[PDB]
Design a protein around this ligand. Structure first.
Ligand code: DGD
Ligand code: CLA
Ligand code: CLA
Ligand code: CLA
Ligand code: CLA
Ligand code: LMG
Ligand code: BCR
Ligand code: BCR
Ligand code: BCR
Ligand code: BCR
Ligand code: LMT
Ligand code: LMT
Ligand code: OEX
Ligand code: CA
Ligand code: CL
Ligand code: CL
Ligand code: FE2
Lengths: 35, 39, 60, 32, 334, 78, 341, 37, 450
């Protein structure tokens, strides 16, 4: 109960998830590029 | 919902799974439209 | 001709309401007193809608 | 046009249907 | 009591050094037949006209092959899918020239390996075991059946079965890639995941068990002598192995249940091999790997190359050279 | 067996996590979207747009050939 | 308490993700390699190095994206962002294939960091370091294939590209130009990998089907306890089964698991030796006796000679597109091909 | 295509055959709601 | 019955095993699953109708159900031209609605209906060990299966006929007036070698044989149904078989694996029950078509195709089979057992006839050969037609390829399932499916091997 919020685990999670969601948004947008 | 103050984990799983399925469906759709579709 | 369109759209709507309601009603043993007659009525009305659609197919 | 719009409408309704059944049963106390 | 009953007790006996069983009553003759014919042919078979164009291919050691290049050559394309036993040849020389040894060896081998799988079930039943080792063995059996029977059936000729040789195997694979793009087939990718991952999990499991061995020997003798056959106690510390692995990656990615771990070890390569066997079996019906040739166009309409196009160039290079005298018409449909 | 950190299930089933993330996650999604859809990615990474693979004067592959002055080579490739 | 001990304490704390001293090397380098691959496959072209589209932005898919090798013009230049080629220009650095050495070198140091992590965690928990020793195999593969092979060749251009179809291209290239399947070191690698898969499957199945009845459920998975002292499956029954089915069987558990380590690791090491050979074009390409006989006897045909013909076809048809910097111009009439095809 | 009177439900018939896949998924939804008992 | 691991002994991922002894719940599962099957039939039919361009061939549009309806003689005319699109729609609609009904019943039995049926009725209640009741269910379903076969016969004979690709004057829907009831032909099909040139039952090549075999199948099934209703398994069957629900499942799995393999082969080779008009050419057909197309072209160019020897010395266009028959040359030599309605008019007693080849080739045969050659069942997974080295502009994968690959895969995995359940049924009947008993571990009482 009443754990820390920010930890090494928090940083490890975000270091991956944050650019992952950014990249996924980029690729989603690419799905609509027309030649 | 069934309990107050928290979301059931199965509801979160269903929502995240549907989001992931939609993302993969968009990618497969894009395989047939726009760039890389051979048309 | 619009009557067929209306009947088929109604049939799809009633199929949706049956698809939702039937599993809930069969899996709520407490509310079986008032959901068994509702099931009977709904099955009858769904069949009626299907029959009406079938007739309007040849009427349109 | 509108074909993908209507298609996604039907698809989303269908998709919600099953989870709607499970959610309603879970919340109302049905057997699961 | 009766003679037949005595024979039944002998065949199903668990005291035989090699279990025979009822599946064994088929396995042993067919496997011995296949082995003897294979050895004889590999050593001394004369050249075989595999492509049915009167262009015999030397497969045996006595006709100039080494172990790497030697093979039992698939039967002639002229035979197609016809049954070609010895008694349908005018002479043994004709049978040899048309690749009859291949059919004999392959048919007996296939019967033998299916009976081997049944025999695995049978012995598990006689010993009071659980019955599913044969299910694991069904993966290599499925793969072998795909390359020796299913692919020739779909392609319409036993000449398009895998040759029984090392270089023949490579030829089979290269032509297969040229015609089906097996590398770009997701079932073959799953097979690669199956074997790469199976080796990975074999290395991890062996290394984690070896790493966590309980001290029972001295630094002189082999640590293997710390285990005694039939000992009840555990020979390694699975809790220490779990501590190490769950700290190597993270806690919840590490098995601490040996049974779940061993099920995973069994299941991963078996499933991968099932998928790759089905990949070959469905490419037998020319449902091929992905084709992204000229998938990327620039705005004007000129094709922009990708690595798939380079791969296609390699495939074409293989395609135009293979069986160089066998094709009369522009499309390689057969 | 917990190494000290809050269990993931507890965090991701909590209201506060979702109040935070129903905003943060979509914002990164549409930030990557805008990265692509504004043309920023093309210019940042040097990736050709579909109409810039070839120019009205270069119909061939702009394969780099010079060992040290690639900036000028790429500029003459356009 | 000295500052070094305090740092050592913090690095080795029991947390969800262990860091350790090795983490200082592993995590930044591994993150660089992974993010470099993801960035390149998402955004970065190979138009100027290979004349190929290799990113999602260009319309390629998961199977066709890659971090492609740099242009052959750079030889074995390490292609630092600040180096004489890119000269600090990030866009140009991307365009010349600078991401390939970025990923390769950061991945090499990440692999070193991961194996140091295996050593460090093994030492901390008090077990033998055989996991790191097993991991030496993948390290040998990565070193040979991604570093030594291109180093023996003309440039990094001929290293495998970090991508699915890029790897497939590398595989077919090695078949056509090196006859890599004929190489005995590759055959030992194949034997090791297929044997490792076989051992994995057979051991898992054998254990699962000789389990002791330790629970009442049909679900046998919860009839095990990690702290139990006794074996969970019958080694004696397994040994009898395999002795009667196959002729031989393991009787020593320790030897069994060491073998499961040994087979795939030795396979990887042997294949790496073969790749080192191919780096210098020291191939097992031909059997000279059969070549000479075929040259003087036009009726001598083996599967080996047929494979040689396939290699010739692949080289001629693939080289102009695969090696665009060479400006190979092979007119249609010089291309080898069989009849009607 | 569909007979003329029915082509307003053309974008509905486009998605009908894929429903049994949703049934298979729904099995897992139901087991997840009950905690995979 | 319980619905969790503690009260059933089965985890969630094997949850359907909890149903083994809950006959009412099991019946609900079966009825609902049948609803799924019928639902797919109806929905796929409506999808295919909606995505059907009726002037383009069926096999060019990824259709697998419409060819089944067309073969039965609905909505098509000569050469397979789609006359009426309504019957396809009707088949789909009827399956969809009936699937609704079946799903309602399956849900009722699975969710609210009686858990078990044995204390409710002796007729529907069953016990897996009750051999007489199991044979009763076999008998009822055998009667139904024979009736369905007779339904096929009645459609072919009295209800407009079936599509006959071998019809004179062109392939057409025709009524079969003279099915072959001769048991020599019907049951000699079962004795033909499953190899090239014989084609055990895949070689059935005329609708008379198909309809007559279905009359025989109907009679066999109905009589066997009565036989099983009125008897109990004999002593030999009792001593040879495992008598349990999982054992019966495993038996059915083996049967299904066999049928899946047979169907894959059947669609790959047979062009009678799978007319090329609707399913496209077989691979054999396409190869033979290419050989024919270039024989025709080069002959028009002036090549004397009887005497033209190819590079190897074999005839370029014509050659002999190993039994002497005159056949197309080239690699298609392997496909000389092929028979097709467009090629048999040029075949003499000795094989391909030079006189017919030189003066009897019709323009429609040339068109058909070109079409079949260009629709060879070769294609990529992403549906790029032609050989794998071709470029992306031809969107085609043969329906034969889809059906054959899918059903070989399903046959294989059902063989796997049969092995799994047969082994498990044996182990459970003998009582060691849960593992080795430490007290009575059988190998501990065995003499050492050496
Ligand atoms: C328990 C029982 C075990 C039984 C064992 C007995 C052996 C079984 C296997 C037979 C092997 C056959 C090999 C050659 C097959 C072949 O020549 O071809 C296939 C044959 C069909 O034969 C073909 O039949 C054709 C019939 O078409 C003819 O007639 C047609 C009429 O429309 C057309 O006109 C056509 O143009 C014309 O040629 C032709 O005659 C061909 O020449 C002829 O080859 O299939 C058949 O007869 C039989 C069906 C084969 C099923 C496919 C094998 C399944 C394997 C599964 C492996 C799984 C493993 C899992 C392991 C773990
Ligand atoms: C009619 C055929 C049939 C029937 C009635 C059964 C029935 C049963 N099987 Mg079984 N099985 C079958 C065929 C069948 N099987 C086949 C063909 C195989 C080979 C693969 C197996 C292999 C098998 C195993 C290994 C086991 C069973 C078990 C069982 C029992 C419980 C299973 C359960 O709860 O489902 C649960 C359902 C799931 C967990 C979902 C599985 C999803 C699969 C793996 C993937 C589906 C892919 C599909 C093609 C769709 C693709 C989706 C794509 C879009 C992503 C049950 C009585 C268990 C048992 O022995 O009980 C005592 C068990 O351990 N079966
Ligand atoms: C064809 C697929 C299929 C079918 C017919 C069944 C059927 C059944 N399963 Mg099962 N199962 C399946 C697949 C299937 N399963 C798979 C893939 C898994 C792995 C995840 C499982 C794992 C599993 C477990 C662990 C258990 C079962 C159990 C059961 C039985 C009880 C059902 C219940 O109470 O749950 C209740 C669920 C609900 C009340 C939610 C709503 C369900 C309805 C039917 C949804 C219908 C929606 C539909 C669109 C509406 C149309 C209605 C009408 C208008 C047409 C039942 C007969 C239980 C059992 O064995 O009982 C003893 C059990 O414990 N299954
Ligand atoms: C093979 C499928 C099958 C089987 C074996 C059963 C079996 C059973 N059902 Mg069920 N049912 C089914 C499908 C099935 N049902 C379907 C699809 C629905 C949805 C409509 C229902 C809805 C249902 C309800 C609401 C009830 C049952 C009940 C029962 C039980 C009593 C049967 C009885 O005596 O009533 C009488 C049987 C008859 C009067 C015979 C009528 C035969 C049919 C209706 C006429 C058509 C025959 C047809 C020509 C034959 C071939 C069918 C065709 C499609 C090929 C029994 C164990 C009852 C129960 O459980 O008791 C408490 C109950 O209340 N069923
Ligand atoms: C799905 C339909 C079905 C099912 C499940 C059964 C099931 C059964 N029947 Mg049967 N039967 C059926 C249809 C069916 N029958 C029909 C339609 C008829 C009318 C012809 C019969 C007539 C019949 C008789 C006369 C008898 C049975 C009997 C039996 C019982 C044991 C027989 C046995 O072991 O099988 C397996 C068969 C064997 C073990 C014998 C070996 C056969 C050969 C050697 C196997 C080779 C097959 C080969 C590889 C496949 C090639 C295909 C083709 C070329 C031959 C069993 C429960 C017996 C019984 O106990 O009656 C109450 C019995 O005496 N049935
Ligand atoms: C529950 C059972 C429900 C339904 C049972 C089936 C009923 C089929 C009745 C329709 C028959 C046609 C009547 C008019 C007519 O003569 O043919 C009119 C047309 C054309 O049929 C024509 O019939 C003529 C009669 O002299 C001639 O024989 C012509 O040659 C023939 O072409 O038939 C149709 O368009 C209807 C399509 C038939 C398909 C029905 C089979 C599948 C039905 C149900 C499957 C449900 C499964 C649920 C499980
Ligand atoms: C380059 C570079 C760099 C680096 C960078 C980095 C490091 C980054 C990054 C990055 C990253 C890190 C990114 C990411 C990403 C991602 C993605 C793109 C994802 C994905 C995914 C997916 C698609 C998945 C899917 C799925 C599946 C398939 C399975 C199940 C379900 C799911 C959904 C999960 C720097 C600047 C330093 C320098 C220069 C160079
Ligand atoms: C038991 C169980 C289960 C299962 C379930 C199932 C299996 C089911 C089903 C069901 C079904 C199987 C159903 C159905 C349905 C149907 C419907 C609902 C219908 C309809 C109709 C309509 C509406 C139509 C219309 C139309 C027409 C008329 C024509 C035109 C077109 C259209 C389409 C519009 C699960 C697994 C989940 C789990 C839990 C338990
Ligand atoms: C319709 C049709 C037809 C007809 C057909 C038929 C008439 C048939 C049949 C068939 C049959 C009539 C069959 C059968 C079968 C049998 C089986 C499949 C068996 C078996 C066996 C078993 C399974 C056994 C087992 C065992 C053993 C081995 C010993 C011990 C005991 C036991 C039981 C374990 C034709 C082609 C003409 C034409 C086309 C169409
Ligand atoms: C005919 C028709 C109809 C019908 C319909 C139906 C028949 C129904 C249904 C329905 C359904 C049937 C639905 C469903 C669904 C579902 C879903 C949406 C699911 C899922 C999901 C997910 C995402 C999951 C996930 C997961 C997993 C698997 C793993 C672990 C756990 C979890 C949960 C996370 C209608 C009415 C429209 C109208 C008319 C026409
Ligand atoms: C574990 C160690 C990891 C090593 C890598 C870590 C990242 C290292 C990045 C170093 C980047 C070097 O980047 C380099 O910076 C210098 C100094 O500003 C730039 O130099 C620039 O500014 C300086 C003065 O301000 C001018 O003299 C010069 O002409 C101009 O180019 C270079 O153009 C750029 O290439
Ligand atoms: C984007 C954020 C991350 C998204 C994460 C998506 C995956 C999350 C999990 C997916 C759902 C798994 O579903 C999980 O199943 C477990 C099985 O242990 C069950 O676990 C729970 O079961 C029941 C809930 O009814 C509780 O009484 C029980 O105490 C609890 O263990 C729940 O059903 C759910 O917690
Ligand atoms: O034989 Mn051995 O590979 Ca099967 O593709 Mn046609 O056939 Mn031949 O040509 Mn390419
Ligand atoms: Ca539509
Ligand atoms: Cl070749
Ligand atoms: Cl040819
Ligand atoms: Fe082990």
């Amino acid at each position: 109960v009443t754990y820390p919020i920010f930890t090494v685990r928090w940083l490890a999670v975000h270091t991956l998830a944050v650019p992952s969601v950014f990249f996924v948004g980029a690729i989603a947008a690419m799905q609509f590029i027309q030649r | 919902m069934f309990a107050e103050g928290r979301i059931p984990l199965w509801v979160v799983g269903v929502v995240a799974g549907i989001g992931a399925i939609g993302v993969l469906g968009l990618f497969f759709y894009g395989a047939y439209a726009g760039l890389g579709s051979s048309m | 001709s619009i009557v067929f369109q209306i009947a088929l759209a109604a049939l799809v709507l009633f199929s949706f309401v049956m698809v939702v309601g039937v599993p809930v009603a069969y899996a709520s043993p407490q509310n079986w007193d008032r959901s068994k007659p509702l099931l009977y009525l709904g099955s009858g009305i769904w069949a009626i809608l299907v029959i009406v659609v079938a007739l309007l197919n040849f009427l349109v | 046009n509108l074909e993908p719009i209507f298609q996604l409408t039907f698809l989303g309704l269908i998709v919600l249907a099953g989870p709607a059944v499970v959610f309603v049963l879970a919340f109302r106390g049905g057997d699961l | 009591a009766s003679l037949w009953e005595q024979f039944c007790q002998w065949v199903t006996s668990t005291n035989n050094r090699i279990y025979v069983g009822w599946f064994g009553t088929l396995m042993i003759p067919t496997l011995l037949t296949a082995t003897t014919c294979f050895i004889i042919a590999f050593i001394a078979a004369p050249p075989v006209d595999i492509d049915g164009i009167r262009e015999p291919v030397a497969g045996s050691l006595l006709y100039g092959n080494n172990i790497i290049s030697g093979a039992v050559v698939p039967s002639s394309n002229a035979i197609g899918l016809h049954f070609y036993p010895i008694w349908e040849a005018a002479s043994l020389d004709e049978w040899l020239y048309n690749g009859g040894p291949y059919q004999l060896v392959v048919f007996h081998f296939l019967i033998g390996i299916f009976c081997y799988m049944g025999r695995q079930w049978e012995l598990s039943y006689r010993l009071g075991m659980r019955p599913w080792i044969c299910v694991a063995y069904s993966a290599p059996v499925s793969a072998a059946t795909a390359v020796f029977l299913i692919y020739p059936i779909g392609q319409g000729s036993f000449s398009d079965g895998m040759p029984l040789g090392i270089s023949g195997t490579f030829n089979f694979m290269i032509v297969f890639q040229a015609e089906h793009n097996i590398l770009m087939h997701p079932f073959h990718m799953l097979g690669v995941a199956g074997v790469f991952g199976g080796s990975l999990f074999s290395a991890m499991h062996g290394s984690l068990v070896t790493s966590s061995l309980v001290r029972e020997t001295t630094e002189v003798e082999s640590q293997n002598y710390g285990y005694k056959f039939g000992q009840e106690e555990e020979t390694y510390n699975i809790v220490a192995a779990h501590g190490y692995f769950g700290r190597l990656i993270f806690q919840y990615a590490s098995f601490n249940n040996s049974r779940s771990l061993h099920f995973f070890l069994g299941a991963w390569p078996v499933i991968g091999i099932w998928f790759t066997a089905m990949g070959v079996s469905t490419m037998a019906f020319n449902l091929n790997g992905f084709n992204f040739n000229q998938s990327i166009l620039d705005s004007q309409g000129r094709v922009i190359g990708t690595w798939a196009d380079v791969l296609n160039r390699a495939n074409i290079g293989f395609e135009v050279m293979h069986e160089r005298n066998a094709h009369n018409f522009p499309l390689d449909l057969a | 067996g917990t190494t000290g950190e809050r269990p993931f299930s507890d965090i991701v089933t909590s209201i506060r996590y979702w109040v935070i993330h129903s905003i943060t996650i979509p914002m990164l999604f549409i930030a990557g979207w805008l990265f692509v859809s504004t043309g920023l990615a093309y210019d940042a990474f040097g990736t050709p747009r579909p109409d810039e693979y070839f120019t009205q004067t270069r119909q061939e592959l702009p394969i780099l050939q010079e060992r040290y002055d690639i900036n000028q080579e790429i500029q003459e490739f356009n | 308490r000295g500052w070094f001990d305090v740092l050592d304490d913090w690095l080795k704390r029991d947390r969800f993700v262990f860091i350790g001293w090795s983490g200082l090397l592993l995590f930044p380098c591994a993150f660089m390699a992974l993010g470099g691959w993801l960035t390149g496959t998402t955004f970065v072209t190979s138009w100027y190095t290979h004349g190929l589209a290799s990113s999602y932005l260009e319309g390629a898919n998961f199977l066709t994206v890659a971090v492609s090798s740099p242009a052959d013009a750079f030889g074995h230049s390490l292609l630092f962002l600040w180096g004489p080629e890119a000269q600090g220009n990030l866009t140009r650095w991307f365009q010349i294939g600078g991401l390939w050495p970025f990923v390769a070198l950061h991945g090499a140091f990440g692999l070193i960091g991961f194996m140091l992590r295996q050593f460090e965690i093994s030492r901390l928990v008090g077990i033998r370091p055989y996991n790191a020793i097993a991991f030496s195999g993948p390290i040998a593969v990565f070193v040979s294939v991604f570093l030594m092979y291109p180093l023996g060749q003309s440039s990094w251009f001929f290293a495998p590209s970090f991508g699915v179809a890029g790897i497939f291209r590398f595989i077919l290239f090695l078949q056509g130009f090196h006859n890599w399947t004929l190489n005995p070191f590759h055959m030992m690698g194949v034997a090791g990998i297929l044997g490792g898969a076989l051992l994995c499957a057979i051991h898992g199945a054998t254990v699962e089907n000789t389990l002791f009845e330790d629970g009442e459920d049909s679900n046998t998975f919860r009839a095990f306890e990690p702290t139990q002292a006794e074996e969970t499956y019958s080694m004696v029954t397994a040994n009898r089964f395999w002795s009667q089915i196959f002729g031989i069987a393991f009787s020593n558990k320790r030897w069994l698991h060491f073998f499961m380590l040994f087979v795939p690791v030795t396979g990887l090491w042997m294949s790496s030796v073969g790749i080192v050979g191919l780096a210098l074009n020291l191939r097992a390409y031909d059997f000279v006796s059969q070549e000479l006989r075929a040259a003087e006897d036009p009726e001598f045909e083996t599967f080996y000679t047929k494979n040689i013909l396939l290699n010739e076809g692949m080289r001629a048809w693939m080289a102009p597109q695969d090696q665009p910097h060479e400006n190979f111009i092979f007119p249609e009439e010089v291309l080898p091909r069989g009849n009607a095809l | 295509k569909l007979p003329e009177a029915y082509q307003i439900f053309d974008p509905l018939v486009d998605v009908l055959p894929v429903i049994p896949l949703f049934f298979l998924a729904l099995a897992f939804v139901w087991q997840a709601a009950v905690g995979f008992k | 019955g319980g619905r969790d691991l503690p009260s059933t002994g089965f985890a969630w991922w094997s949850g359907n095993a909890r149903l083994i002894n809950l006959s009412g719940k099991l019946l609900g599962a079966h009825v609902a699953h049948a609803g799924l099957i019928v639902f797919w039939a109806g929905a796929m039919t409506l999808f295919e109708v909606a995505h059907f361009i009726p002037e383009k061939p069926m096999y060019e549009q990824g259709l697998i159900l419409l060819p089944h309806i067309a073969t039965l003689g609905w909505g098509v005319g000569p050469a397979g031209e789609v006359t009426d699109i309504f019957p396809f729609f009707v088949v789909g609609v009827l399956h969809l609605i009936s699937s609704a009904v079946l799903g309602l019943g399956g849900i009722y039995h699975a969710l609210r209906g009686p858990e078990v049926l044995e204390e409710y009725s002796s007729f529907f209640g069953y016990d897996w060990k009750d051999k007489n009741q199991m044979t009763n269910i076999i008998g009822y379903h055998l009667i139904l299966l024979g009736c369905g076969a007779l339904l096929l016969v009645f459609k072919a004979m009295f209800f407009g006929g079936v599509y006959d690709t071998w019809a004179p004057g062109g392939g057409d829907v025709r009524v079969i007036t003279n099915p072959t009831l001769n048991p020599a032909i019907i049951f000699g099909y079962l004795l033909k070698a499953p190899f090239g040139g014989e084609g055990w039952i895949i070689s059935v090549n005329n609708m008379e044989d198909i309809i007559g075999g279905h009359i025989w199948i109907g009679l066999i099934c109905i009589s066997g149904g009565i036989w099983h209703i009125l008897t109990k398994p004999f002593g030999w069957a009792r001593r040879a078989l495992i008598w349990s629900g999982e054992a019966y499942l495993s038996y059915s799995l083996g049967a299904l694996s066999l049928m899946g393999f047979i169907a894959s082969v059947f669609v790959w080779f047979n062009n009678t029950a799978y007319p090329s008009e609707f399913y496209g050419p077989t691979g054999m057909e396409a190869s033979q078509s290419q050989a024919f197309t270039f024989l025709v072209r080069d002959q028009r160019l002036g090549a004397n195709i009887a005497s033209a020897q190819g590079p190897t010395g074999l005839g370029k266009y014509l050659m002999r089979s190993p039994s002497g028959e005159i056949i197309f040359g080239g690699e298609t030599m392997r496909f000389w057992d092929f028979r097709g309605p467009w090629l048999e008019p040029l075949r003499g007693p000795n094989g391909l006839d030079l006189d017919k080849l030189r003066n009897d080739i019709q323009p429609w045969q040339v068109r058909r050969a070109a079409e079949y050659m260009t629709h060879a069942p070769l294609g990529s997974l992403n549906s790029v037609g032609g050989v794998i080295t071709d470029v992306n502009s031809f969107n085609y994968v043969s329906p034969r390829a889809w059906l054959a690959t899918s059903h070989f895969v399903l046959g294989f995995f059902f063989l796997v399932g049969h092995l799994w359940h047969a082994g498990r049924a044996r182990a459970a009947a003998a009582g060691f499916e849960k593992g080795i008993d430490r007290e009575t571990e059988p190998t501990l009482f065995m003499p050492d091997l050496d």
